[PDB]
Assembly symmetry: D2
């Protein structure tokens, strides 16, 4: 079949697309403290600036879906925005974060470059609407429970609300109970179903372990995708959420150098028409 | 092992529990019109009153998670509450409906007897809190993506927010892409993990087909459960949502007569201690 | 839809069919010793004779698919047949056992009443042929990896080889890694795909745990099926294979009394035509 | 963690190992005719000789597990061996084929270089024994129903029978009904569980579609594996079995040139120690 045309979604200067050099959407799970966010952001900026990899800093200001109510959730919106603000002014970074309610969408859109629709919330029509209305670039987490052929409906819902700036993010599919598998065929399926919307791959959450980050990242990149989504921490074990999948921050460079070399080759391969 | 003690959650006079006669939580998918809600409610009341089956009328006032924005969603809260009000005054029915945002919880709790936490929203902590705070009986839809051993965390989150009136509802588990299976072992697992919270079974959504309602209902009832959750319509094919799984309303009586006979036997069986 | 007609497969005097009283195909996993086989058979005969339940004694003479070569496999064919022979002469029992190679089919058919096609072998055409050629009643284990709609091909393969005496046996379906789920909808599907061939349910292997035998047996029986397949042992923990799922032999009576009461009700229910 | 040492299994001069250049085990599904086998073999030899890729020709002499008895199965053993013989003398190729019964193992081992254990048969202990006893290199198809951590038991069973020449072959895992997914994490798991036995990837059967051969092959290769297993045909649609997944033979070169470039990079990457 013919190679299809891929859509470009700009995050400022960064052209995000399936057939462009991969963009790194990465950071930490939650904004644990200002100092930690500054340390992590600085390392990512330094490393990506060195390797020549497009970069958008990720962190959550709230964890809205933990298993206990008293359990640590982040700094919340007000204080999280302050930290994003300082990261932007200090480092000149683009920022992505997730939003959890309709009323959060515009105030967070006022600060960050990409707003993220959580997997469990990805079919909530009023949230999609509120997020669409900000005109912000969107990242939609593909639900663990959704087939890859169904991502067109998500893109279309945003388009109906006037927003054509959608990036889709792979984060694994249910494989029996309490395990996820990443279907590498799903990348192609989503590229088709979305008429070439950029697809990125959340390797970290797909591992819900961290030792396997490298191998799984290479497999997804090998399918020709618009980016990788990664969370890291100086000591993953002490991360306040999802520590068991977080990449050790000190390994970011050797990991990314390999990703870049791999992506650069992959992006150079001609399409083979197989019928 | 020993038979454990099962918790009773009262919906007014109705004692809902795994070892009591099953309670029917049933109605229609969405409040399509006042006349349709009146016709459907009346038939269910007449049939359940005749058979001697405890009954709580179900309908949604909004469909918050459809695949298109312009697509029909229901009458919304204001007008839906008016219809519930008329159903209550006319028929003396208990009512269950789902809530989709924190701000909906109290105003709907002011009208209905049981508020329902949708499957996709079941881990949203702020929603659980808002729902817990109303003091209303809760029905939690078990996510397709959640293992049955994990339902304890849901019950516990409500308890921490001061609400011990939780009923759990089985609605199938992911089985590959775009199919669901109901694990009949999950009933026992949830009864254990929840310290005997009432478990009901949404047969209709488990079938996401309707021909198989009977066979699947009997299998779930055979495991000893607190109730069944069913949606019906005079002509399922013209139902404005999820028509393909809805029971034809005219078949309600022969279906329920069988359920009652089956439940009555099941509830009579002694526990067998197998180690 | 209309209730379809169900095929009867006779194991001597026993009419095995989906709409007849359920037949018990049960015994022990492997022929551990003559004394154990005699003790187990006697208890099953006594209990089933008392309750009025049709009965076929099960045991394997070889375990052909263990994980180690030096690991205990049974008495083998010659000596296993001797034990079946003594069971038949002593107790007047019908016997079912599994066959693993083409050359085993006729010599075992010469002794037993039902020959069983193992799940992993169920698509091996030359084995189906050799088994078909004996003219024996067949029990086919449905592979964990096979959809229920595909059982027609199995029945048809036997029919082409001249054998119309096939019983199909449910034993769970893959649910992610290292777990099985039993799809209760699959019973109806197989009844349709097989034009009403008798379907029995191996509760014991579906549990690959034993505590849950009761609950799962009741769920499967509730769908209207031709029999149950059960393995038991005086002390399951010391069973030489699959001990962790074996029913404790002393619990056979209370278990079967419940099964009979349940089946008798189920078999009394009229078909409900839902379209 | 440390990079482990990988075992080399020689197929003549060809060192097959996870950290060596990938070896191509490829050909056609079934030996449809001598001329077709000659045409297909010649093209593969020419292309692999040109690209510098190690090569072992694959074809089945029998399809033992089709869905109908009268349905085409291949030339059978006698005549299949004759064709392998001519391929070897003409082209100097190494040959792999599958064996289906104990009695086939030695006579096929007498002709071919690698004997293959089919997925459905992979736990049959007597077959493993008979295959082990030939001293031939073995390729074991990993069952769709087996977790990757369980491959150690297979390698160990061969070792107990005196055969340490085992190669493991990924061919997908059950993903609900009638679909397979390839878990890219399973490669690492098998490398560990098998103490570094060579793992190859059957891309063709994993697709049980053919359009996606390229994308899936690249994903598996990206994890660092010992080879690829591929079936092709001049006109896949007219292939006498599994046509819908077969690579079009004319596309072999552009496909393999990409595989080689990708593998060569992957094999050059240092291990990253992530804890």
């Amino acid at each position: 079949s013919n190679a299809m045309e891929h859509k470009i979604v700009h995050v400022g200067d960064i052209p995000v697309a399936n057939d462009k050099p991969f963009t790194l959407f990465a950071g930490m799970n939650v904004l644990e403290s200002r100092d930690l966010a500054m340390q992590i952001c600085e390392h990512y900026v330094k490393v990506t600036d060195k390797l020549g990899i497009p970069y958008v800093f990720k962190a959550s200001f709230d964890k809205a879906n933990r298993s206990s109510v008293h359990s640590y959730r982040g700094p919340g919106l007000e204080e999280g925005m302050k930290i994003f603000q300082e990261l932007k002014e200090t480092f000149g970074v683009k920022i992505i974060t997730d939003v959890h309610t309709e009323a959060q969408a515009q105030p967070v859109a006022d600060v960050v470059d990409v707003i993220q629709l959580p997997a469990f919330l990805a079919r909530q029509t009023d949230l999609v609407e509120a997020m669409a209305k900000t005109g912000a670039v969107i990242n939609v987490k593909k639900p663990q429970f959704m087939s890859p052929g169904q991502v067109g409906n998500i893109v279309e819902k945003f388009a109906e609300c006037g927003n054509d700036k959608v990036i889709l993010c792979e984060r694994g599919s249910c494989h029996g109970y309490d395990n996820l598998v990443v279907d590498m065929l799903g990348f192609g399926v989503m590229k088709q179903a979305s008429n070439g919307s950029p697809i990125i791959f959340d390797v970290t959450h797909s591992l819900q372990r961290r030792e396997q980050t490298v191998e799984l990242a290479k497999a997804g990149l090998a399918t020709g995708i618009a980016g990788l989504f990664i969370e890291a921490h100086p000591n993953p074990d002490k991360a306040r959420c999802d520590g068991p999948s977080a990449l050790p921050l000190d390994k970011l460079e050797p990991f990314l150098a390999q990703m870049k070399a791999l992506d650069d080759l992959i992006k150079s391969f001609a399409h083979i028409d197989i019928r």
